């Protein structure tokens, strides 16, 4: 069971072509969603069309500025803070 419930977990962490993961194929179409970071700013905000900015130099094929965020690294899960160090604040924080 820890296999079937795992052999099938890995197929949804990466084996999407792209759906919020899918590091294999290419950018999903919703990566290129027209987001307007500011009037006249669309994906880089550093120059003009940062994806198309590096398309001017030889980096047309090897530079990608859209956040194909399947590739993104996921932050570590946040957990409950350590208990307080003073009994007054130690038990009151257990009264929140």
């Amino acid at each position: 069971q820890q296999y079937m419930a795992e052999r099938r977990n890995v197929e949804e962490y990466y084996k999407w072509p792209g759906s919020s993961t899918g590091s294999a194929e290419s950018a999903s179409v919703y990566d290129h969603t027209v987001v307007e970071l500011a009037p006249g700013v669309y994906s880089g905000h550093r120059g003009t069309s940062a994806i198309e900015s590096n398309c001017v130099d030889d980096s047309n094929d090897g530079a990608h500025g859209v956040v194909q965020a399947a590739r993104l690294p996921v932050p570590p899960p946040k957990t409950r803070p350590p208990p307080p160090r003073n009994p007054l604040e130690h038990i009151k924080y257990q009264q929140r």
């Binding site: 069971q1 419930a5 099938r8 977990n9």
Partner: protein, 50 residues
């Protein structure tokens, strides 16, 4: 002997409600079927990742 040992007007709670399904009713043996607890309904439905 397979019967339930009380006049079934006392155990009519089982026969009209939706306990018609959750109960063995073979020859009036109004005995509960098997029923998972809530620690298991989620143990069996999360391990499937459903």
């Amino acid at each position: 002997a397979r019967r339930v040992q009380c006049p079934t007007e006392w155990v009519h709670f089982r026969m009209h409600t939706k306990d018609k399904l959750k109960y063995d009713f073979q020859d009036l043996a109004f005995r509960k079927k098997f029923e998972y607890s809530y620690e298991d309904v989620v143990a069996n439905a999360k391990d499937m990742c459903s």
